[PDB]
Amino acid sequence: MRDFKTYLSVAPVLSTLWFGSLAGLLIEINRFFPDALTFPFF
Amino acid sequence: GFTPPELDPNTPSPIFAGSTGGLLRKAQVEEFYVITWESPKEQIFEMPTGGAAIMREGPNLLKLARKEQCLALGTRLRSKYKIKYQFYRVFPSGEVQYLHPKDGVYPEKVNPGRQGVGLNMRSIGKNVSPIEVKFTGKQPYDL
Amino acid sequence: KYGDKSVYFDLEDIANTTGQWDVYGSDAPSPYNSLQSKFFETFAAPFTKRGLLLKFLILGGGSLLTYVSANAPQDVLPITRGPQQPPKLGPRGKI
Amino acid sequence: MNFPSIFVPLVGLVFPAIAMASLFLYVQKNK
Amino acid sequence: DIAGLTPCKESKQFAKREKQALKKLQASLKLYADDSAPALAIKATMEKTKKRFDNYGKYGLLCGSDGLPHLIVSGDQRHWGEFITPGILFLYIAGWIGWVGRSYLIAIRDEKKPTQKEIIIDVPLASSLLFRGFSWPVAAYRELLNGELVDNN
Amino acid sequence: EVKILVDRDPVKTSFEAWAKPGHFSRTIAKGPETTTWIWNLHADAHDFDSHTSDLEEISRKIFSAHFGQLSIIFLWLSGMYFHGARFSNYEAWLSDPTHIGPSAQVVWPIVGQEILNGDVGGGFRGIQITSGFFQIWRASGITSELQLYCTAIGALVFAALMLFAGWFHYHKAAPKLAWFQDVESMLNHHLAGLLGLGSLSWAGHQIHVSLPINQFLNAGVDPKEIPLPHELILNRDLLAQLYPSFAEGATPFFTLNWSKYADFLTFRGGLDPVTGGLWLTDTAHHHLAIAILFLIAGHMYRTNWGIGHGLKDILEAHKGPFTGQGHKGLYEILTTSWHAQLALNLAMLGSLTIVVAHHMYAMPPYPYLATDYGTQLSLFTHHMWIGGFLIVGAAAHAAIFMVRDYDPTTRYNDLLDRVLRHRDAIISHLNWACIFLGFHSFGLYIHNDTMSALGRPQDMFSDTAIQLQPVFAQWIQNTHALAPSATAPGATASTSLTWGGSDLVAVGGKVALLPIPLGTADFLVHHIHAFTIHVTVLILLKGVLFARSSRLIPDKANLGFRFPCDGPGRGGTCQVSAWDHVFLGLFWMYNSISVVIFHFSWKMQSDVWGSISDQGVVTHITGGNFAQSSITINGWLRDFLWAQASQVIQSYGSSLSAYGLFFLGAHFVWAFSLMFLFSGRGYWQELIESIVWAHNKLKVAPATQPRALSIVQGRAVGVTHYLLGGIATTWAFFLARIIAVG
Amino acid sequence: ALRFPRFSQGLAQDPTTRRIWFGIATAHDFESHDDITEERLYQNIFASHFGQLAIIFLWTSGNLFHVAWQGNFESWVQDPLHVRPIAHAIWDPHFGQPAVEAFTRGGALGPVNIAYSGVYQWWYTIGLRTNEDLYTGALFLLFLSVI
Numbered sequence A: 001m002r003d004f005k006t007y008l009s010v011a012p013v014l015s016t017l018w019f020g021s022l023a024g025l026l027i028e029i030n031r032f033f034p035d036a037l038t039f040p041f042f
Numbered sequence B: 001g002f003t004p005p006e007l008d009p010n011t012p013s014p015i016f017a018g019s020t021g022g023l024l025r026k027a028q029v030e031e032f033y034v035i036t037w038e039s040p041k042e043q044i045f046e047m048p049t050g051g052a053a054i055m056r057e058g059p060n061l062l063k064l065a066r067k068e069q070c071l072a073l074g075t076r077l078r079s080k081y082k083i084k085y086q087f088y089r090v091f092p093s094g095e096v097q098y099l100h101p102k103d104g105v106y107p108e109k110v111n112p113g114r115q116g117v118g119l120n121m122r123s124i125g126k127n128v129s130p131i132e133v134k135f136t137g138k139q140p141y142d143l
Numbered sequence C: 001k002y003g004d005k006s007v008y009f010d011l012e013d014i015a016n017t018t019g020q021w022d023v024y025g026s027d028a029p030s031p032y033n034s035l036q037s038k039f040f041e042t043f044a045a046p047f048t049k050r051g052l053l054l055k056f057l058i059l060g061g062g063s064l065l066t067y068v069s070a071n072a073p074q075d076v077l078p079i080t081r082g083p084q085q086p087p088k089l090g091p092r093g094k095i
Numbered sequence D: 001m002n003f004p005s006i007f008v009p010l011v012g013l014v015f016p017a018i019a020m021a022s023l024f025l026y027v028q029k030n031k
Numbered sequence E: 001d002i003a004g005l006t007p008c009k010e011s012k013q014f015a016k017r018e019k020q021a022l023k024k025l026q027a028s029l030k031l032y033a034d035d036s037a038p039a040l041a042i043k044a045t046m047e048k049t050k051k052r053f054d055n056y057g058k059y060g061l062l063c064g065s066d067g068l069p070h071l072i073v074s075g076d077q078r079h080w081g082e083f084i085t086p087g088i089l090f091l092y093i094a095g096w097i098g099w100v101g102r103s104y105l106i107a108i109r110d111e112k113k114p115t116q117k118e119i120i121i122d123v124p125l126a127s128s129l130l131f132r133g134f135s136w137p138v139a140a141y142r143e144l145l146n147g148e149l150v151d152n153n
Numbered sequence F: 001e002v003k004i005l006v007d008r009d010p011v012k013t014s015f016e017a018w019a020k021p022g023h024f025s026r027t028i029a030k031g032p033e034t035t036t037w038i039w040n041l042h043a044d045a046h047d048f049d050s051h052t053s054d055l056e057e058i059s060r061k062i063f064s065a066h067f068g069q070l071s072i073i074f075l076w077l078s079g080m081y082f083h084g085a086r087f088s089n090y091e092a093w094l095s096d097p098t099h100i101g102p103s104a105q106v107v108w109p110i111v112g113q114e115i116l117n118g119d120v121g122g123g124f125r126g127i128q129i130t131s132g133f134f135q136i137w138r139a140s141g142i143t144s145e146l147q148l149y150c151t152a153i154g155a156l157v158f159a160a161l162m163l164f165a166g167w168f169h170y171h172k173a174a175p176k177l178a179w180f181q182d183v184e185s186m187l188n189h190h191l192a193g194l195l196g197l198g199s200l201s202w203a204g205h206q207i208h209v210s211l212p213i214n215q216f217l218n219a220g221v222d223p224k225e226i227p228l229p230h231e232l233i234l235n236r237d238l239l240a241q242l243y244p245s246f247a248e249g250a251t252p253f254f255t256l257n258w259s260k261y262a263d264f265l266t267f268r269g270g271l272d273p274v275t276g277g278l279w280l281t282d283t284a285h286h287h288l289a290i291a292i293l294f295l296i297a298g299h300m301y302r303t304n305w306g307i308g309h310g311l312k313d314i315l316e317a318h319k320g321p322f323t324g325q326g327h328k329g330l331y332e333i334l335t336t337s338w339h340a341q342l343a344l345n346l347a348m349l350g351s352l353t354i355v356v357a358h359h360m361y362a363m364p365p366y367p368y369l370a371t372d373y374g375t376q377l378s379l380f381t382h383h384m385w386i387g388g389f390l391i392v393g394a395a396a397h398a399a400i401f402m403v404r405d406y407d408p409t410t411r412y413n414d415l416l417d418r419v420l421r422h423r424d425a426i427i428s429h430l431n432w433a434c435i436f437l438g439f440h441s442f443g444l445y446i447h448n449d450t451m452s453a454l455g456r457p458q459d460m461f462s463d464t465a466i467q468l469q470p471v472f473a474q475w476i477q478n479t480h481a482l483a484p485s486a487t488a489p490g491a492t493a494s495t496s497l498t499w500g501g502s503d504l505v506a507v508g509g510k511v512a513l514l515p516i517p518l519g520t521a522d523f524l525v526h527h528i529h530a531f532t533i534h535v536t537v538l539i540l541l542k543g544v545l546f547a548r549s550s551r552l553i554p555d556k557a558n559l560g561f562r563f564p565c566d567g568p569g570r571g572g573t574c575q576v577s578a579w580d581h582v583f584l585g586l587f588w589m590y591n592s593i594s595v596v597i598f599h600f601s602w603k604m605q606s607d608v609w610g611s612i613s614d615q616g617v618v619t620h621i622t623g624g625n626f627a628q629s630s631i632t633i634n635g636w637l638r639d640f641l642w643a644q645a646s647q648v649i650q651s652y653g654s655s656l657s658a659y660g661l662f663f664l665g666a667h668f669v670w671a672f673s674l675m676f677l678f679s680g681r682g683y684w685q686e687l688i689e690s691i692v693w694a695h696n697k698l699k700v701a702p703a704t705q706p707r708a709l710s711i712v713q714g715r716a717v718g719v720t721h722y723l724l725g726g727i728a729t730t731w732a733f734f735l736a737r738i739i740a741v742g
Numbered sequence G: 001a002l003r004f005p006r007f008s009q010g011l012a013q014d015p016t017t018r019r020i021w022f023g024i025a026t027a028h029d030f031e032s033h034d035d036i037t038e039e040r041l042y043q044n045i046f047a048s049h050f051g052q053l054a055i056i057f058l059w060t061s062g063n064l065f066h067v068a069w070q071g072n073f074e075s076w077v078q079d080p081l082h083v084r085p086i087a088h089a090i091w092d093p094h095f096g097q098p099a100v101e102a103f104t105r106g107g108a109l110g111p112v113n114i115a116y117s118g119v120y121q122w123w124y125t126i127g128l129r130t131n132e133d134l135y136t137g138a139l140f141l142l143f144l145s146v147i
């Protein structure tokens, strides 16, 4: 299990997980707040 | 006092069937190299000019066009078959120059009696700038 | 020597060692007729001198090319004759 | 007199022939 | 009306562009029955387009003569949300990422084989240092003041 | 002697080697000291010959990698069948194939990309596909989405089985070396059990399933009312109504009264007028005959029983006066070198793919395939590219054999030695052939361009000018047009409609195939093709022959197969390796295939594809301008590139806008490749020095020291991005042009 | 040196063809030549500058002469618009007849090239109005080149 967790900590697997989570977050943000050209909250 | 071994023209050649990578006009108007070795067993080797030849038992003589070919073949013989080799340079005038072991000992290992040519008693970064050698034939590395 | 078996290097014989051979040159005598040879010898003598032949070739070629180009008939080359057509206007009115 | 018909062959054909002939003879010299 | 630009909510060309978009979407919509899934998708796209145009009009954007909104980055307070506020947010996030990466590189600098901690990321230390970039401006300012940001070699 | 030689549990299944990167070799498992190591870790990953010197482990790794590749292929096939079951309009396309565009992919409604869901027809919005899976499924008798779902599930199960087999045959029960070297039994099983039995089973499927379902479909019967394929198996009378010979059973086969089967086994030829494809009875008889031929061709080589042939004896029996000892010693070379087998199989598979593309364009074997212009163009272009890549890889691995696995002390072949002895003559003669072909093929185009630009159209090499007519190809076309008359009296029609005659097949107002005319333009393009192929052959064969030694570097084999150079000496020894010869030949293969696909696209758009009017006239897409415009480079630039790029540059705002974006991105990537192709490592390393100083100033420099890409890696990146951009450009341009107008 | 190039002994004895190349791209780099001093380098630079001035003047004189001899400057002065300038005449033996048709522009009697260098407007603005002025200017520039 330690070796498998070490494999999960290697550069491509960790990069894939991180970038997939980031892409999912950005896609969900773009669904819930679509067509954002300005920052109108202030 | 090592004396260079004389070339034996009557040395038999390896059994080869002919290749297009051999000698050319440069062998006639200019020099060509000749490598001689002593095979203890009739075996088969790979020519540096492409293809494979069959060396015969005893002394063997091979004429090639470049010194690099002679040295590559000699390195192959020494590493793979463990054969002592010497190659010469032959001019169209018939002159023979004994080339490779200049003192009978291989250049990789140290041997007394060799003189230093191209020796600079400084580090490489202590070379003189080109502006200080301008308008003179001397190069910074030659000083 | 060079001609013995399994040996191809001779110090006293370099031309055979280095392959200095006439592969297709033949020492056979002249097959042409003697009168033919004499006629071609006396009728091609002025072209023997190579520098004179070079100068003569350059001068004759230049002179003949200039003479042909300058005095060519007008109906041979389309550039020698003019347009023989009315010129057309530009896409903004000749400007 | 039609001057292009004389000078255009001279500059495009005769002069280049003379120039490359002279340069080929000068380059291949062994002084 | 900065730089001769009409506001997008008072621009005829903006409404014209919305009209062309809605007309093209209706022309695509006419090929299917209204109770079908492609018709519902097209209707959702039209509603999204209407909401987008209304939001662009109400956001205060200045529309050019071609009917498209033009951003002003000169610093005008009416248009601070086009460049300056998103720019500050981006600078904060980028400083977060850079500070976290620099902290991770500093932490694994004095090891036996630091390169092994670069091909294989040590996740607990990285997750410990992830939230240290939340206060990255304060930490960076103090490190610059104490002369720890730069290395004098 | 040919037994199952398998050792049990050779490799322990564990994640320890997963945790250590680069475990396979020694110089890499020590850990990264620079960034270059990372690239090396992706360069020697599948080079099993360098990891170990034992052939057994290499062969086992090869076998399990093949299993993993088969699992990936089965997974991909399951995905295509699933995306044809769900998210597709296959059932709608079955009713109206001539007006509904095939589609099997739908995009999600995010960031405005839902514009890519185009109105393909059949009450469906999605991306139009050009892989021609719908035509395969119609030719297979599939009339429902449940069948596609079942096929997807079965392919998923088969992918899992392939993955389990790959794990099993390496980690649990691995074959021995003598198991792999039993080439005779392998050939027997792959000719009789793989190809022969596979062809027999597919012929059985076509006879029992595809023929009645397709007969019902072409009879106008609604697809949902067609009887299920198993109903035609349990009820023999249902199949007997369409084909009465089925009432006789298999007794005509067993009594050699095969002529009774002349209702579903016909040598008809031509195309089906209803569907525009080959007759399915013709395909059934073809696969039956192929199965018989392969099954009797698979009992040739010797095995445990004394009957059969020995490959070694067959090779040793062929030797001539010119070749000396002949093919003796080739068996030991081919049975102990995986790279030689890879070279041979890659060359054969690339040539097979090329001939596959030509024969699919010339004979569409699926219903409503010829009238789908996008499918035809995509299939031809794709298989052309695949064949070219495999042919290049053939020489790429022949060079590896010559560098690594070649030695004359043991495993000596006389033919290879005699080839290597006169390699200068071969290379010089091929060089002269390339120069002569280039001059007399492209200088003709230059001559035509100059004559047209000078206002001398009578001096060009045109049909209305000096004519270079392909008399040989026209004679071949004429001979094959009259083949049913004398040479093949048992065939009703010719083997294709691309030879001649008054025949013409049109389905749904679109032309399927026409007799293709051959003129001066085709002559020039074909000789351009020959020139490009000969130059690519020259580069690849020169690399293969001089991969070991030459007059410049007599010890090039000691430097390796893949090395950058030998320094700036001898005037410069840049790109002397055979890997660089492959890298150069990649561009020329790209050029050749690009010219081939441009020729195909323009010729079929101008002289074959088009529309049929109700009166009877035919109007083509480009109006038949190939004969007069393609003879000049300006014609290719204007009437082919400029004219047909209007469908890809004006695709913005519509469903084809992804093709315009890919057009621009492919142009960008092709330009980006020139940075790697034109530059050198030293400048980038010196710039990286300054960037490293900037990072070190702020204590942010990494322990892995940044290094510029190596010379070979720089060339590889350049050629990879070059091929990717220059191929995706043609992909987007072809797809947008042939979908918008076809 | 005994062989071309004579300014480089290292290139002269080269048995390959690169010598022929390398004697061209090193001809004007005096600082890398053989047996050169500072004053000789400066004098060579001075002489090459004089030569370059001569070619510049000769090129300008050729432009003026060809505009005067084959152009339409006099007819362009009267109508600066609706008249295309003519740089020089075209005499191509390889020309076809439609090439002669299409290239006959302006008031010319044969094929001509339309000047796009703007020399017509520049000469018209600064006072030149007739072809004899262009001939005199070409003669003066030729004299300057000789000087």
Ligand code: CLA
Binding pocket: C057, C058, C059, C061, C062, C064, C065, C068, C077, D008, D009, D011, D012, D013, D014, D017, G093, G094
């Ligand atoms: C710049 C100068 C130049 C000039 C003046 C010409 C001139 C001409 N071209 Mg061209 N040509 C050029 C450059 C030039 N070329 C280049 C660079 C190329 C290579 C792309 C070509 C390729 C080319 C081809 C392939 C052909 C021509 C031909 C033609 C002829 C046009 C029609 C005609 O007159 O036929 C009438 C022709 C003749 C009566 C020939 C007269 C030549 C005289 C009598 C020969 C004696 C002297 C001769 C010039 C050589 C010696 C001089 C010097 C070397 C010492 C004409 C001679 C045609 C040709 O000449 O073939 C018939 C033709 O087929 N040219």
Ligand code: CLA
Binding pocket: F062, F063, F066, F067, F070, F179, F180, F182, F183, F185, F186, F189, F190, F192, F193, F194
């Ligand atoms: C008649 C039976 C037979 C069959 C069908 C095959 C078929 C195949 N072999 Mg060959 N092979 C055989 C006998 C057979 N072999 C023998 C006796 C030997 C030893 C001398 C070899 C040695 C051999 C090697 C060394 C390799 C192959 C490979 C392959 C595959 C390449 C072709 C391809 O992928 O097409 C696609 C074909 C199919 C998917 C159609 C269905 C075939 C099914 C799935 C295969 C089941 C066949 C198997 C032999 C029997 C089951 C065993 C049982 C314990 C379960 C293919 C699955 C190559 C490979 O890809 O390996 C993974 C490979 O590396 N074969």
Ligand code: CLA
Binding pocket: F055, F059, F180, F181, F183, F184, F186, F187, F190, F191, F195, F311, F331, F334, F335, F336, F337, F338, F341, F344, F345, F346, F348, F349
């Ligand atoms: C010049 C004549 C010649 C030609 C044209 C070919 C051409 C062909 N041969 Mg080869 N072959 C030759 C001589 C020739 N061979 C000789 C003299 C031998 C005896 C050593 C072989 C041995 C041989 C075998 C044993 C096989 C081929 C196969 C094939 C075809 C490969 C199929 C492919 O593309 O992959 C597409 C996919 C597959 C079907 C192939 C799967 C991969 C195979 C099984 C791996 C090759 C392994 C091989 C035994 C190497 C082991 C090394 C060992 C010593 C350690 C290809 C068309 C294969 C074939 O019969 O296919 C029907 C095959 O099984 N060849």
Ligand code: CLA
Binding pocket: F042, F043, F044, F045, F046, F047, F048, F346, F389, F390, F391, F392, F393, F394, F396, F397, F400, F561, F562, F579, F582, F720, F724
């Ligand atoms: C048919 C199967 C096949 C097989 C099994 C092999 C087998 C092998 N090849 Mg050969 N080869 C083939 C076909 C094949 N080749 C073809 C068709 C070509 C022509 C291009 C070559 C050309 C070739 C070269 C030039 C070299 C080899 C070498 C090798 C060895 C190591 C491979 C490596 O480590 O890469 C591991 C994997 C990678 C490096 C992947 C690279 C990524 C590729 C280039 C990108 C593909 C782009 C993709 C479609 C775009 C998507 C975008 C992206 C964002 C995802 C191995 C023996 C190498 C060798 O033996 O070294 C001594 C080597 O030098 N091969």
Ligand code: CLA
Binding pocket: F431, F432, F434, F435, F436, F437, F438, F439, F442, F443, F446, F535, F538, F539, F584, F585, F587, F588
């Ligand atoms: C696009 C322009 C281009 C051109 C014209 C060439 C030209 C050529 N390539 Mg190169 N090449 C190119 C791009 C190009 N390459 C690129 C991008 C690469 C990177 C991969 C290479 C890499 C490369 C390789 C690896 C090889 C070549 C080879 C060849 C030669 C074979 C063709 C032949 O000799 O036919 C005859 C000549 C031509 C078609 C060139 C145009 C000549 C026209 C038809 C006539 C010109 C008129 C006449 C000479 C009058 C002159 C006028 C006068 C004033 C001088 C030829 C010199 C092959 C070779 O060496 O084989 C012999 C070879 O192996 N090339």
Ligand code: CLA
Binding pocket: G045, G046, G049, G050, G051, G053
């Ligand atoms: C007052 C007298 C005098 C004059 C007239 C000159 C003039 C000249 N000298 Mg100098 N010189 C002098 C004194 C003088 N010198 C003295 C006393 C010494 C010794 C200390 C030198 C030492 C010297 C050396 C060593 C050299 C020169 C050089 C030159 C020439 C420079 C090249 C050129 O033509 O520039 C042309 C430039 C202009 C007329 C003005 C500058 C142009 C500006 C930047 C552009 C803006 C102008 C305008 C927009 C133009 C419009 C263009 C039109 C088409 C519309 C020029 C002829 C070089 C030489 O002689 O070459 C042969 C050189 O090598 N000189």
